[PDB]
Amino acid sequence: KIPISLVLRLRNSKKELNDIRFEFTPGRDTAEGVSQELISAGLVDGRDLVIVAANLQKIVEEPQSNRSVTFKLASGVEGSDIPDDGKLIGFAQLSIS
Amino acid sequence: KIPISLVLRLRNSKKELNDIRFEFTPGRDTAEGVSQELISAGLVDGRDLVIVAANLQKIVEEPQSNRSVTFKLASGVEGSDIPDDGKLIGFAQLSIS
Ligand SMILES: [Ca+2]
Ligand SMILES: [Mg+2]
Ligand SMILES: [Mg+2]
Ligand code: NA
Ligand code: NA
């Protein structure tokens, strides 16, 4: 169908926050496939494969209704940073562009 | 039991953002009942009961993992306004406090 324009906001190894812009085409892409692409590109931690896919699936099922989600990262449980959803420390935000 | 503490962010007719704070106790409260409380208080449009309750239910199922959601309102927009998810015009934001 028509590609969905997405923004994944999360912090890298330098703890810098970045807007990762990518697209998802229903019927062509899969949530877990796109999540792996992001990991292979070094943009997402591999430990977050399942969680990022799960939340990507939530947004693409009904994108006119569900515009953004903020969710805990598995990789953040294993870091020393104190988790803080409001500043995306140990959490990520996935939104329609 | 320790209630879940939540905040619903809505923009009023003067284009002002308001944060509505409320609580949800699992095993006691229901998503529909707490949503109707917000409506009875005059804080949420009755037209939005179903969508707000549905999103409340989703966030209280795993509140440690799912921290915020931005979703379309059924009460819609009026005047010269067009829906705008970034500005929460015709959309609402529900978060763990
Ligand atoms: Ca927008
Ligand atoms: Mg693609
Ligand atoms: Mg009361
Ligand atoms: Na917090
Ligand atoms: Na206007």
Side-chain angles (χ1 to χ4, degrees), chain A residues 2-13 15-61 63-97, chain B residues 2-13 15-20 22-57 59-77 79-86 88-97:
Chain A
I2 304 296
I4 297 174
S5 295
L6 294 168
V7 180
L8 178 58
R9 298 169 29 81
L10 59 77
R11 298 180 181 271
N12 58 20
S13 66
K15 297 181 192 329
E16 313 173 335
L17 185 61
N18 293 287
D19 293 7
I20 306 163
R21 302 175 171 273
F22 66 97
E23 283 170 26
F24 178 107
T25 311
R28 297 202 183 284
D29 290 312
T30 60
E32 161 184 34
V34 171
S35 176
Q36 181 59 65
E37 286 164 20
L38 294 169
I39 292 151
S40 296
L43 298 174
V44 171
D45 196 284
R47 293 167 290 182
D48 298 323
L49 171 69
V50 176
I51 298 176
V52 165
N55 283 277
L56 181 49
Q57 188 64 218
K58 302 183 190 178
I59 296 280
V60 302
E61 259 146 6
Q64 291 292 334
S65 290
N66 304 322
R67 305 299 291 183
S68 187
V69 296
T70 302
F71 48 97
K72 195 167 164 72
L73 295 173
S75 61
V77 180
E78 298 185 19
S80 59
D81 279 325
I82 297 97
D84 181 355
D85 49 3
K87 287 182 199 172
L88 299 177
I89 303 162
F91 296 78
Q93 177 175 34
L94 178 67
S95 297
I96 304 287
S97 187
Chain B
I2 306 302
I4 303 171
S5 300
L6 285 75
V7 63
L8 179 63
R9 178 176 284 169
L10 283 189
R11 198 179 287 277
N12 58 36
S13 54
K15 299 294 188 291
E16 293 161 354
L17 283 171
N18 296 139
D19 286 337
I20 302 152
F22 64 100
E23 304 191 320
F24 187 98
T25 303
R28 181 154 332 288
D29 277 326
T30 63
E32 193 186 307
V34 175
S35 299
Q36 183 64 53
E37 279 185 69
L38 295 178
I39 290 155
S40 299
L43 295 171
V44 171
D45 194 309
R47 284 161 191 81
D48 294 322
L49 172 58
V50 177
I51 308 181
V52 170
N55 276 280
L56 183 52
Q57 177 72 30
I59 208 171
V60 299
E61 274 182 356
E62 279 158 335
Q64 355 85 13
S65 294
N66 306 316
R67 307 294 296 183
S68 192
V69 70
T70 297
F71 54 92
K72 188 176 174 57
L73 290 177
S75 59
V77 295
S80 53
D81 279 354
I82 63 174
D84 185 329
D85 52 356
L88 300 178
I89 300 174
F91 293 87
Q93 193 183 32
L94 179 65
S95 309
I96 310 297
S97 281

